[PDB]
Each structure stands twice: as structure tokens, then as C-alpha cells.
Amino acid sequence: AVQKVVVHPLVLLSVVDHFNRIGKVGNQKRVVGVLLGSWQKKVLDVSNSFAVPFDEDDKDDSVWFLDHDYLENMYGMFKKVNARERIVGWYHTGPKLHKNDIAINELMKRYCPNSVLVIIDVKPKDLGLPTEAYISVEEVHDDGTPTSKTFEHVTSEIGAEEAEEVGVEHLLRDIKDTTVGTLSQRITNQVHGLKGLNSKLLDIRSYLEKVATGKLPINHQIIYQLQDVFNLLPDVSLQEFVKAFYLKTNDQMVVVYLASLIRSVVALHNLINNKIANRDAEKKEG
């Protein structure tokens, strides 16, 4: 129902500053807040946020609190300063998907129908994009419970904007491997993209940890896809897939042979424009 989410770097920074101002508790606190923004043309947008007071005792961890008076008036202010801005859902700091986040969402779905959550990172280390979001779906279905409900991850990325790209590219000043030539693709997707497929291959190995020893639910709806991946694994090298491969190598490299041939004569002409300024300059000036 929802294509994708769009997260701006403002709200990305507008959690971590709050994680620092509650980082003095030391023991345990998760940053849970209210996510503001719109969604237009079937694309979920994220613009603004704040954080709501929240505590959690370890024994009987089903007692949460959202001070809704703090939720009412501060959104009442933000609607007043920006009528275009509205609620879009909520978020939590999400180290490892805590347990209250099955009914935090159902507590505050009376404001947003598709009340989406956002899992963020507080310790940044990965080879990907450490911003997670799910969606709420329920089922009167197959085997688990008469009342069953499990979150499903919708794809997530950091969307840009013209006004913030001034500030985003100003605050970096560290490294930015621009000048896209023959080697930007070599590193953004040929060094890294092959190692992109590393952790996707390694992820199904982590599910494979249950061969006879792991957790008790076994498969039912996980293996129809895995049966297809080995089935839709690509065509072997016997057909004219051999021959049509050498066909295009004998076509694509022709253009490379022509273009490289051109590059020599161009720089050869530039050598002549430098001998016109050497021999015709020593006799004149000295």
C-alpha cells in the first residue's frame, strides 16, 4: 500500500541530539518520539519530529507512558507555525526492536491511519543504510494466534531536498568522492556492490541456523522463495549465451577502439600547440 519512505537529514539529526540530552541517565532509556510529516503521491515523506517523555521498568515491561498533553499542544503549536506540516506516525530509537513496540503503534493509531514507525541508529557502523521502517499488518490467518499481527519492513532511504543540500554538503567538509567518471561506479557499486551481495547472502545463512538445533518454528512461509532462488538461478553457459556474449564484446569494444584512437590525435594536436609556444618564443623574448 505504501511505496517507500523519504527521510530528511533534519529528523535524522533531530533524534541524536535528543539521545544526547537523555544520555545522562546511563542505565537504560530508549528514545521514543512523534514523527511529523506528510505523504503525497503514494510516497511517505518525513520532515519533522520531537520526542515525548517515556520511562520503562524492567519487571512487567508492558507498562508504557505517552504524556498525550505533551503530544497535543506541541503538535498544536507546530500546526500553527506550519499548517502544511502534520503527523505522519511515530518512531523509536530501535537498537533491537523492544517489546512495547507492538502496541505503542496501536495506542496512537487514532491520529495517523497508517501509523508508521522508524527505527534509527545511535551507534553508526554497517555497510548499508542504518534507517529502518516497518508497516502494521494484521491477519486472521494460518497458524499462530486467533489475533495475529506482525510488522513488515517497507523499503527505506534518506531523501534529499534543495534547501537542505546546502546545509548537508556544508556540514560534511571531510570527504566526498564526486567527479563521476569511470571510477565512481567502480566504488559505489563495484567494490561495494559485490560486498553489498555479501550480507544478503550471509543473511539467509543466519536463518539457516535452525537445521535441527535452532528455534522451534520451522518454515512454512519462508521456503517457497528460497526454492525459487535456486530455480530462477540464471542460465548456464552452453547456448548462444556463449555466442551472443562474444557478439557484443565484438561490438562494444569497437566503439572503445574508435574512441581511444581519437584521444591520441587530440593530444597529439595539443603537443603542436605547445611547440608553437616554445620555439616561437625563445627567439623573441630570450
Partner: protein, 116 residues
């Protein structure tokens, strides 16, 4: 005459040794031709009876042909040299370019963008 394929005119010169004996030399030249024809029996030949390629070296019919026919193939049968002319196993190799050309395409980009 050993450079080109000529073999008979080689042994016409083994009918013509004028100067001295030259015996130990042409016998090594026998031996390095014996494995050569036992090498070049392995071309694309059909059924040959036990007379035609039996006389291509010198020999009439000793058991020396069984020494060659059990060293290599062309199996002893009912007056037959069996041809295992397969030459089928090696082609359809995309991987050998796909390892080597992936090396070469990177080598194109080395002397293309980075200053040397």
C-alpha cells in the same frame, strides 16, 4: 626434410648414407620418428586394416604393432584401428574470458583516469 611432413624421402636418405657408417645417429632418427608416427597415427583417421598403417613405418607384421597399439589407442580389433576422434570436451568457456577480461578492463581504467 624432417622440417616438413616428408618421411619417405627421409628414409630414401636412409637408403643413401654415403660417407661413413652413421649407424648410431639414424637409429636415434629411427626412434624419434617411431614415436612421431605413433604420435601422428592419432590424427583424424578412419578404420585402417592391419596392413596399411602396419607398413607406414617399415614393419611387415611382428608383435611390434601391438606395442604401439597398446601404448596409444586405435584399439586392436577385427582388422581395425578404432577412431576416438572426439575433440568435444573443451569449448563453451565464458568463465576463462570472464576471469581474464575482468582483469583487462580494470587495466584499461588504470591508464585512463588516474594520473601516472
Amino acid at each position: 626434410y624432417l622440417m616438413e611432413g616428408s618421411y619417405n624421402k627421409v628414409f630414401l636418405a636412409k637408403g643413401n648414407i654415403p660417407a661413413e657408417s652413421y649407424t648410431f645417429f639414424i637409429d636415434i632418427l629411427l626412434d624419434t620418428i617411431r614415436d612421431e608416427i605413433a604420435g601422428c597415427i592419432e590424427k583424424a583417421y578412419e578404420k585402417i586394416l592391419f596392413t596399411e598403417a602396419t607398413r607406414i613405418l617399415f614393419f611387415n607384421t611382428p608383435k611390434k604393432m601391438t606395442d604401439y597399439a597398446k601404448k596409444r589407442g586405435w584399439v586392436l580389433g577385427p582388422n581395425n584401428y578404432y577412431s576416438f576422434a572426439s575433440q568435444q570436451q573443451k569449448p563453451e568457456d565464458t568463465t576463462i574470458p570472464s576471469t581474464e577480461l575482468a582483469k583487462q578492463v580494470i587495466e584499461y581504467a588504470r591508464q585512463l583516469e588516474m594520473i601516472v
